[PDB]
Design a binder for this molecule. Structure first.
Ligand SMILES: Nc1ncnc2c1ncn2[C@@H]1O[C@H](COP(=O)(O)OP(=O)(O)O)[C@@H](O)[C@H]1O
Ligand SMILES: Nc1ncnc2c1ncn2[C@H]1C[C@]2(CO)CC[C@H]1C2
Length: 486
């Protein structure tokens, strides 16, 4: 299902990719990144493209790094709880004020610290003085996990649900019985009903209203969604929470869509593309049904054209500092840089570093070629649901570069103000992004609107920075805003 009549060059590169696969010259897995990235090659073995399947994304289901994790099944209860309970080597108080130690191990509900210390020496087998070791905390931990499992299986109300749950939800029920114990979780009898009948969004609500959750909502909500989605997603990124969970390929393409409309031309053309390759990471089911013929299903991903002759922004800027560019070349760098800032600001890039963009440094009817040129790669971490909570965690790295000190050139204002000042352009931009993002099965209209709000707020700021001839740096000091509808 791959066709792009609007862009026949792109389609042609895609056609070489498929053909090369038919010929068993497979996209090869990039070592140089975290690993759901491939070098697409053509039938002659040259590298024509970079491909990032959605399901191999960092939060991705078929991500190679996290598959080992998915193998464990219920056996993830240990890490799950390590994450919720942390580790402490000295007596502390829990949320309710009860004496605790190691990984969530409750000593007593008594107010006396020596009751607790007493209860602790009994457990460990020595005089602890309220302080235990890593191994001691781990041994308490297993026993406490065993005890939880026993609590569930010794019980008539819990066991039925537990046996009917998939490996991941089972881990969630153990989590609760770790925290509240056998008798406590069995007082949820309603929610156990839903869990038993498999209705997840029903139950995901009732656990939302309890004395529990009320006490430990951050954790409770983490379990509730492990119940709702049958997955580990609440346990892999607490938190980014600035970004939609697994839509990087759409970020990637979207970044390229924006570049196209603003006519920046720093983003190598990127689109949503389907490919099947033996080199990808597929479920075992899929591997088997291929007959080893049916063949592998195509995966949906971002397909980004490959550009040659470029090096790390980092690589070049380091050299230009020791041996500075002549004014005329250096002005070409700056003009390229402005385009980058405009891109990143508009799409609100969250992870542009000096490794994430590339530089290439080399009367009449035709324009002399530029010596210097900028490619913006690795755009899948943009389009956030909202501004980051601590600007220090997700900054704009290029802001600390000296080039960020230079006032926006009239050239960028000329390129950019007529577009982003035209409400029909920004409208059109939102329709194009919409037609792009909605194609995702996990698309959510409410999430989209939030994304757009940020984008509209970024545009609002950019417009005035440009009118006032601010530097890129003064632009980022402008307080972040969102433009919200309803
Ligand atoms: N890379 C960056 N990304 C976002 N903002 C930046 C960046 N570099 C500098 N700034 C801006 O510089 C300003 C100086 O820090 P400031 O926020 O005043 O300190 P504080 O956080 O204590 O108020 C900030 O408002 C911030 O917006
Ligand atoms: N479109 C691209 N063209 C050329 N090189 C790229 C591209 N995207 C990424 N890279 C390099 C940066 C890497 C990190 O993502 C490390 C080597 C490749 C991939």
């Amino acid at each position: 299902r791959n066709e792009f009549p609007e862009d026949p060059e792109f389609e042609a590169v895609v056609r070489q990719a498929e053909l090369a696969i038919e010929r068993c010259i497979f996209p090869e897995r990039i070592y140089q990144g975290s690993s759901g990235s491939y070098f697409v090659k053509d039938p002659q073995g040259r590298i024509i493209a970079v491909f990032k399947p959605k399901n191999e994304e960092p939060y991705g289901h078929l991500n190679p790094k996290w598959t080992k994790w998915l193998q464990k099944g219920t056996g993830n209860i240990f890490e799950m709880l390590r994450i919720d309970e942390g580790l402490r080597l000295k007596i502390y108080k829990d949320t309710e004020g009860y004496y605790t130690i190691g990984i969530g191990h409750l000593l007593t509900k008594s107010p006396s610290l020596n009751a607790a210390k007493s209860e602790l020496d009994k457990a460990i087998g020595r005089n602890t003085n309220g302080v235990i070791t890593k191994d001691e905390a781990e041994k308490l931990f297993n026993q406490d996990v065993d005890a939880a499992v026993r609590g569930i299986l010794r019980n008539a109300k819990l066991k039925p649900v537990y046996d009917s749950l998939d490996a991941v939800r089972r881990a969630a029920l153990i989590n609760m019985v770790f925290q509240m114990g056998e008798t406590g979780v069995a007082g949820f009898t309603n929610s156990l009903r839903m869990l038993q009948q498999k209705r997840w969004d029903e139950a995901a609500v009732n656990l939302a209203k309890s004395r529990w959750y009320n006490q430990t909502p951050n954790r409770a909500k983490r379990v509730i969604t492990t119940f709702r989605t049958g997955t580990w997603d609440a346990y892999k990124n607490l938190g980014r929470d600035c970004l939609v969970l697994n839509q990087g390929y759409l970020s990637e393409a979207g970044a390229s869509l924006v570049d196209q409309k603003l006519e920046l031309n720093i983003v190598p053309r990127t689109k949503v593309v389907y490919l099947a390759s033996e080199t990808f990471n597929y479920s075992a089911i899929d591997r088997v049904k291929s007959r080893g013929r049916i063949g592998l299903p195509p995966k949906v991903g971002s397909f980004q054209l490959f550009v040659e002759g470029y090096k790390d922004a980092d690589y070049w800027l380091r050299r230009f500092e020791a041996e500075p560019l002549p004014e005329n070349t250096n002005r070409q760098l700056l003009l390229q840089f402005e385009r980058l800032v405009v891109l990143d600001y508009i799409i609100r890039n969250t992870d542009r570093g000096n490794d994430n963009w590339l530089i290439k440094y080399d009367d009449w009817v035709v324009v002399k070629e530029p010596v210097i040129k900028v490619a913006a790669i690795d755009n899948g971490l943009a389009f956030p649901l909202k501004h980051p909570d601590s600007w220090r965690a997700y900054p704009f790295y290029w802001a600390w570069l000296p080039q960020a000190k230079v006032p926006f050139s009239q050239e960028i204002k000329d390129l950019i103000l007529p577009k982003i000042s035209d409400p029909n352009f920004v409208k059109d931009l939102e329709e194009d992004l919409y037609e792009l993002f909605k194609k995702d099965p996990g698309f959510d209209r409410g999430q989209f609107h939030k994304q757009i709000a940020v984008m509209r707020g970024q545009i609002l700021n950019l417009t005035q920075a440009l009118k006032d001839n601010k530097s890129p740096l003064h632009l980022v000091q402008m307080p972040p805003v969102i433009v919200e509808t309803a």
